[PDB]
Amino acid sequence: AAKDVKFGNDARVKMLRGVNVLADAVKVTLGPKGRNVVLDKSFGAPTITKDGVSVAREIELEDKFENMGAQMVKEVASKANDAAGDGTTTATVLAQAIITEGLKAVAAGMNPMDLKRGIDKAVTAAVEELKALSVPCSDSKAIAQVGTISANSDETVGKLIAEAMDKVGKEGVITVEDGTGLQDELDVVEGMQFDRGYLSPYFINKPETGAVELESPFILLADKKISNIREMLPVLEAVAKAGKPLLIIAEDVEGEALATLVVNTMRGIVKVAAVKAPGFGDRRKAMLQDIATLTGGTVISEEIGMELEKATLEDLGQAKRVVINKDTTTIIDGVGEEAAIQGRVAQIRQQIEEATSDYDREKLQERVAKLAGGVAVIKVGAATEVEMKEKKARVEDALHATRAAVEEGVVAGGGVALIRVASKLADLRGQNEDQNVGIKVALRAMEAPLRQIVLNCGEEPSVVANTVKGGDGNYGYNAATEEYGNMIDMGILDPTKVTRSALQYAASVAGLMITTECMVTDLP
Amino acid sequence: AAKDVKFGNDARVKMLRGVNVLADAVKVTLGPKGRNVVLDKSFGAPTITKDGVSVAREIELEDKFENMGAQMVKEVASKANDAAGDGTTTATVLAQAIITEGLKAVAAGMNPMDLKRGIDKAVTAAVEELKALSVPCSDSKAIAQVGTISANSDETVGKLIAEAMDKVGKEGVITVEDGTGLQDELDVVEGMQFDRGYLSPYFINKPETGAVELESPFILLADKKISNIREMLPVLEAVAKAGKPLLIIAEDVEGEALATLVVNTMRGIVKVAAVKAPGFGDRRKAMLQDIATLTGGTVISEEIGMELEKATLEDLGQAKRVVINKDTTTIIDGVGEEAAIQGRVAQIRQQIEEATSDYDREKLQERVAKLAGGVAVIKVGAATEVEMKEKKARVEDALHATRAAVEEGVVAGGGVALIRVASKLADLRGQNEDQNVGIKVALRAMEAPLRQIVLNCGEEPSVVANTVKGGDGNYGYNAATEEYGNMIDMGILDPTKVTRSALQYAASVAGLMITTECMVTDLP
Amino acid sequence: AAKDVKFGNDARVKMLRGVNVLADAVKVTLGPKGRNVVLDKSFGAPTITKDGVSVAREIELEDKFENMGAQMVKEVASKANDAAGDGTTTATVLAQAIITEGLKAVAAGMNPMDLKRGIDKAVTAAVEELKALSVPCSDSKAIAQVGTISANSDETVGKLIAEAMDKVGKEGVITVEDGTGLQDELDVVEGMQFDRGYLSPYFINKPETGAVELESPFILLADKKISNIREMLPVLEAVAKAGKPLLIIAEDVEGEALATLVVNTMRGIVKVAAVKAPGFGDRRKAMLQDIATLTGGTVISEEIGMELEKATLEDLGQAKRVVINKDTTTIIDGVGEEAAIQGRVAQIRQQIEEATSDYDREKLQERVAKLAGGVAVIKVGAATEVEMKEKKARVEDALHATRAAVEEGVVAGGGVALIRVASKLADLRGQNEDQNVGIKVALRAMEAPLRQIVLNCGEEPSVVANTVKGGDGNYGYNAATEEYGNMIDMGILDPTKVTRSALQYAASVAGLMITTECMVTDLP
Amino acid sequence: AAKDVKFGNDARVKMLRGVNVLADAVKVTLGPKGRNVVLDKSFGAPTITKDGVSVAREIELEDKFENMGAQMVKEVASKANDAAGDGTTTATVLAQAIITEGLKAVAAGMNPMDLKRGIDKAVTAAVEELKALSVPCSDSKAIAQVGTISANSDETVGKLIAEAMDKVGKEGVITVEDGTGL
Numbered sequence A, B, C: 001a002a003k004d005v006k007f008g009n010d011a012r013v014k015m016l017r018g019v020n021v022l023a024d025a026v027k028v029t030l031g032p033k034g035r036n037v038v039l040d041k042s043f044g045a046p047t048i049t050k051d052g053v054s055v056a057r058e059i060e061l062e063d064k065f066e067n068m069g070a071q072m073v074k075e076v077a078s079k080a081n082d083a084a085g086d087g088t089t090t091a092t093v094l095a096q097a098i099i100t101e102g103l104k105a106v107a108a109g110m111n112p113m114d115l116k117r118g119i120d121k122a123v124t125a126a127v128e129e130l131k132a133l134s135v136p137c138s139d140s141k142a143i144a145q146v147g148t149i150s151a152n153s154d155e156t157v158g159k160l161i162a163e164a165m166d167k168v169g170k171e172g173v174i175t176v177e178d179g180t181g182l183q184d185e186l187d188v189v190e191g192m193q194f195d196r197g198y199l200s201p202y203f204i205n206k207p208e209t210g211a212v213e214l215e216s217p218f219i220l221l222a223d224k225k226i227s228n229i230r231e232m233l234p235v236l237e238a239v240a241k242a243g244k245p246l247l248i249i250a251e252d253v254e255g256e257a258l259a260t261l262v263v264n265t266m267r268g269i270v271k272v273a274a275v276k277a278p279g280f281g282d283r284r285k286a287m288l289q290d291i292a293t294l295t296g297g298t299v300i301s302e303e304i305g306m307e308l309e310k311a312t313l314e315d316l317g318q319a320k321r322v323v324i325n326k327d328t329t330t331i332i333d334g335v336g337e338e339a340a341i342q343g344r345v346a347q348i349r350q351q352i353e354e355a356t357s358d359y360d361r362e363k364l365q366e367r368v369a370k371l372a373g374g375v376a377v378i379k380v381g382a383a384t385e386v387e388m389k390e391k392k393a394r395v396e397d398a399l400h401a402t403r404a405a406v407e408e409g410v411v412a413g414g415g416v417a418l419i420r421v422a423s424k425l426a427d428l429r430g431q432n433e434d435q436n437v438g439i440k441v442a443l444r445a446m447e448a449p450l451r452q453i454v455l456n457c458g459e460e461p462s463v464v465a466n467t468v469k470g471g472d473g474n475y476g477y478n479a480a481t482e483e484y485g486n487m488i489d490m491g492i493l494d495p496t497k498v499t500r501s502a503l504q505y506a507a508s509v510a511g512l513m514i515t516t517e518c519m520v521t522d523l524p
Numbered sequence D: 001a002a003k004d005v006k007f008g009n010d011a012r013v014k015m016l017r018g019v020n021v022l023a024d025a026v027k028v029t030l031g032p033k034g035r036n037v038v039l040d041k042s043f044g045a046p047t048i049t050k051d052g053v054s055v056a057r058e059i060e061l062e063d064k065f066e067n068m069g070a071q072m073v074k075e076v077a078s079k080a081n082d083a084a085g086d087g088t089t090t091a092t093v094l095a096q097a098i099i100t101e102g103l104k105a106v107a108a109g110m111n112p113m114d115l116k117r118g119i120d121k122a123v124t125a126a127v128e129e130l131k132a133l134s135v136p137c138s139d140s141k142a143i144a145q146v147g148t149i150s151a152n153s154d155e156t157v158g159k160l161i162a163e164a165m166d167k168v169g170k171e172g173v174i175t176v177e178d179g180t181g182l
């Protein structure tokens, strides 16, 4: 309808106001000594949190343009979370630091394009420096430290992640779920993990993790874009008679077949789950057959005439468990016989032998690794169900952080990595002077996270930041103990992936908001 | 939607305003001589109460941030109530005292972390001192005094609780309900008490206690996560034909099964009750078999193929009564033969003999204690049903208080315990000066409850507090008689668990409020 | 209802205000160095776009008359987009330039008719000059450059378009869709393209392209305007039983048939697609029989008694795919045998031989070209489905731009073509002085797009525009590299059709608003 | 009275807005193509003038901070009028340009005192360069050209002033007054 349009300086001022509000509200929770934020949980008691993710999620400014700026920086922090699993607060702190200085530069009269080029160059150089300073994470000690640091100082999370990590190799498939009692357990089931997000967010039965859990489910191996719900109706009735959950690996469920199935999720005919089918054509049928032989099911495809109307319970797959995330789906301990799995992996190994292209060999090696490795199951022994879900979510996010670390290395925590990077890149320049100014803005932003942590601790950020900059290597300020020392020695590690993703995304949103000239919104 | 965000000083000022409003409204009711609070009972007549629980529950500030502050100090007081059953007003009085002084310190310029560390250290030392000064509660006289004091001067409650307590030992299971006549009756039956909460609050038929009472119910021993209401529909029909109430001990009723059971419970086909199954795997099946042999029923499990579709009336358990609370469920006088119970306890004793781990031996000894100990039934007698319910609720809360006392000792009542603790810890100091200031704030808070009681009595709190501080041991001020004397001699006892929980929770909420920097709420 | 009427100067002032708002919001995104515009995407995160089409689409002024002016200049830009596929922002930039200067001329006192005549004359001369300066686009190099420039610096789009273009000739039929994976493919199916827009916008299953895709559908070769759905109800049931999609090439679907087909299309009983039948009388039946022989179906017509009630599954045509746009519909690999197609094209060649009129020979030659040439299929390869849709949309719009270029030539990009045209037409005059003023206004407008691009780059538009005007031929300012040079050498090409359409439409809307005297709108 | 105090960039922006208002009023009267400015007078008819000093004198803004900026940059035109008698529009144009570019550097973290020192050094060197680049203006033709350019390209005024200085020499005194004729 009628819309309000802001141009230039007014638009950027509103942007900065909204970004400042969100960034303050989130950054007050950065570091181990973060403050508390009281979020009004509607009718119930307020939730006091030190988690910047929740504070950012709950922030929605009244003013439409300020709200828009807050939402953009928030969503870029969310991109950082998705890419890394940690550093959303750091990304917001970095984003505000570039944005506040950058928008001041724009309001001065400097060219937004030059500033964006300078910040892009500085952040690219910063990522190169972080890769240079990154130390590979292969020993279980570093993995435990990373898990502890990403679990908000939880040593048990770090040590369990390290144990399960070394048990199945650094590239192995690891899953976590609730335990039996108050003791943890480590198991090696024979399953696999294929990228398949849920086709509807309403499938989520776990609000603490945004994932769908099915125990002893029925795996339907559709190789056709499902458009109607009528042709699996006998199959749905058979599953309901069986009572086990039903999940669907189809190419794409579109139209009413989705919506009706969506409706079924609140009707509870079965525990409906729908995921996309990874791979295409030959690859799609290859991993579909792999899932069939892992779960003992049969691949049903319309091309071979195997229509969903004739799909019986025997053709339907079966496994011990399945987990569905927004990006990938892990099938856990399929009931298919070990002999069939061994035959399938042998066939794919001879496919590797006959393969000549690098892509073919690499993909088939990934396939055989997926089938042979299985899944590492962790049964965390927390006391209560609330503690079950919270500890398992912490373990999951810290596990993702550890995987990011082992794929990209680790660096000094507490913002020391960015401090060292800024010290290394202090001399970097650009084509013109405004690019150099953007570089300086990015360097101050790199300083920002450690300063914010020290500010949260109550100490003066200037003295501590100067002391850390004076030190070399990984010298820094342990905030939890409020004492200086080597971050690696005191276990304050940051996954290099986390830091590089946070900085890159903060630079992205900063440049986007700096170069923005007009904003349109619904009129109040 | 749109949200209002407060930062720092404004946030904490709103916090203090809300806390002050709630704390005044509640603390005017502390002690035997508490004032009256008139709560508007909507259309009907107002309710005058001296019970701080009701006053706190009815308090909901108009201003959103003041509302959040009041709501969460209220919820911390509720945590104290749940942990102890008494000292809700004392927890609020302590909470206001720390928050008022602590937030004054923050507004001065002192560091919130330093204050929180100091308060936490002072409260930990206070709990140690309270444990040191606690006198074990084993004689029936002390139990009677604690029961009387937790019911706000109800001698009959204390004496009946003491009698039932000594009848079945300090670790026995005790339940209370309405008697036949106007006199109290003490009985010993063969029941048991397993931790389980009702899966829906709508099951509560007793608003005065938040508990579900089923007389002569049908116990269904589910060992499976119930997800549908279809499979026990014949069982529901059989129960409705019988007419007795139906309760289900299930692992977890999730999905549409819970919703259908709720729809049934406001449709009243049967008296539907659902509780979670305590224990896991071997322990779960062990206590399920214990319940089966106590109630004469048969364990129904899908693993052995004993599916709920074939569940008949014979397999259903039967007992004299069952009481369901939010955390624990007690079965009263199951119809199983004494010979079967004796055989089961003999089997578990043999399990104890063959067990070697301390955990297994302790768990099996707990099982045999719960089985062979029996249940002390108190058929309390009152003139009217309203008086019946009020007396039984007072007896229940005082019984919980007596259990807390016998598990943690007793201390001088009327705030004398905290006065003595502050006198003992006057010399305690922290790492820096602001930690010492937080310690002093905690000590003044320790003084606060006795001062508030004396203020309620109309006397000057300063003179009486000075006189109590000058005295040593358990010397204090009897408020009901308005005269000094030994707290134990005049029966003014406090369960040590009550006081330590109230102080610890008050310190927790105070530190959370002090370290809080930002608040978000829905825009008015 | 009640309406607000503006007259003369006030109306034109409102025109200018609304046009200025929209033109600013869109023009801040012109050129490779365009700024960012933040569009509020309702509840979700804001969308940052440099695409002027989206910014123009969002803009809707609150003031009714300002909104009206913005909407009409926006719709003229949309006409330019539809006619060319590119230059929407350029059309708006040109429109504002004429409008701002023209409405100043009207407010001065000059005659609107004289200004409109002058602008029309200048734009006609500009189109003649652009045709003169246009260089034919036949080599794959120029096609690749045009595809890259229309896709906003996407070299892969340009090269793939050039390859597919040279594969099937400059007049060949080319279609694009999603590929298998990350790799592209170039094939030539046997199909044809006919002008038939969808009869309901709700048929669109591709919001990113506004097109309807049916994979392996059933073609209904109806030769009658379908106004009732009852008589194909058995056909609809048969199609639903088969499960394949369904499209109708009837003359028109209107009234009850249209409403019921729409109801079906949100109910999704079958994938309903309705398109009008191209051709008339002999031509209509001729192309209907061509579709029948290509898809192996049978033409169903009420004139020969072949009523839709007796239409069985065999009579319906079958093809590999079909794409429906708002203006034309393309079939993809009909299942008709190649022998039947060869016989049909031989018959139409004999018709060419027997044809005497130029129209008959040309139409039959077009028919044989459509049948024999087939359809070029591009399976573009991208990582993700969202990337699939975005890359295929960019490829489609750049393909339309390349077709416009090859049918009208190419000119210097970055507004250099219009600068050169203004330099050539600087001497042109009109009947009276105000016509000359309109000519000068149009010349400044021709200068406007390059000036706006340079302004977006941050450089001074005056110096760069003077330097470009000083140069001759195709000398200009590469904005992406921020350096001068030959546009053809640096690959900054503009399809001459795009530029002439943008300029002509801008002149059209400018003259319409200048000659406008009265406004009526709904009263606020 | 009660004071409003504005710090940093808010104060600088308001000051610059006032300077921009005054200088925009003044600088539409610069050059041969510069236009005129109407100044409303409390007594009599409005004054149509092209002098930058008159426009600068008349400018006073509602906002107290913008008015502070305007009254501060008005001193450039006033001092230029008092000292040289001409160049008041050029003086105001130069002042605003130094202010606009100076405030840009101040916003970029530069030290304003050192910016002032650099501006002063540049202007001292510029005065030296002007003294070097100047040429004597002694003949009547150059005086006619100077007067013509200073009278907004009015050749009659320049010729009249050249004739007046020729008649009264170096020691004579020339004054300008109202005349009856056309």
Ligand SMILES: Nc1ncnc2c1ncn2[C@@H]1O[C@H](COP(=O)(O)OP(=O)(O)OP(=O)(O)O)[C@@H](O)[C@H]1O
Pocket (backbone or CB within 6 Å): A029, A030, A031, A032, A034, A050, A051, A052, A053, A081, A085, A086, A087, A088, A089, A090, A091, A149, A152, A412, A413, A414, A415, A449, A453, A477, A478, A479, A480, A481, A492, A493, A494
């Ligand atoms: N003991 C410590 N001393 C100093 N810095 C620490 C310490 N522990 C963690 N850090 C640093 O503090 C940051 C962790 O803060 P926090 O976990 O609150 O937020 P985050 O990593 O930005 O993201 P998220 O809110 O999503 O968890 C990291 O930069 C980490 O290196």
Ligand SMILES: Nc1ncnc2c1ncn2[C@@H]1O[C@H](COP(=O)(O)OP(=O)(O)OP(=O)(O)O)[C@@H](O)[C@H]1O
Pocket (backbone or CB within 6 Å): B029, B030, B031, B032, B034, B050, B051, B052, B053, B081, B085, B086, B087, B088, B089, B090, B091, B149, B152, B412, B413, B414, B415, B449, B453, B477, B478, B479, B480, B481, B492, B493, B494
């Ligand atoms: N006769 C008495 N003289 C002095 N203090 C007493 C006397 N009886 C009880 N007290 C003290 O007064 C307090 C009891 O007050 P009250 O029961 O109103 O509130 P509470 O214990 O804070 O909690 P709740 O409101 O939940 O019952 C305890 O601290 C108790 O030790």
Ligand SMILES: Nc1ncnc2c1ncn2[C@@H]1O[C@H](COP(=O)(O)OP(=O)(O)OP(=O)(O)O)[C@@H](O)[C@H]1O
Pocket (backbone or CB within 6 Å): C029, C030, C031, C032, C034, C050, C051, C052, C053, C081, C085, C086, C087, C088, C089, C090, C091, C149, C152, C412, C413, C414, C415, C449, C453, C477, C478, C479, C480, C481, C492, C493, C494
């Ligand atoms: N590298 C370049 N240097 C200079 N001008 C360029 C360059 N690349 C493209 N252009 C010019 O910039 C314009 C392309 O801008 P843009 O694609 O944002 O908008 P548009 O052509 O008006 O239409 P649309 O918004 O519908 O795509 C064209 O005039 C093109 O000739």
Ligand SMILES: [Mg+2]
Pocket (backbone or CB within 6 Å): A086, A087, A088, A089, A150
């Ligand atoms: Mg973190």
Ligand SMILES: [Mg+2]
Pocket (backbone or CB within 6 Å): B086, B087, B088, B089
């Ligand atoms: Mg009490």
Ligand SMILES: [Mg+2]
Pocket (backbone or CB within 6 Å): C086, C087, C088, C089
């Ligand atoms: Mg374009």
Ligand SMILES: [Mg+2]
Pocket (backbone or CB within 6 Å): D086, D087, D088, D150
């Ligand atoms: Mg002059």
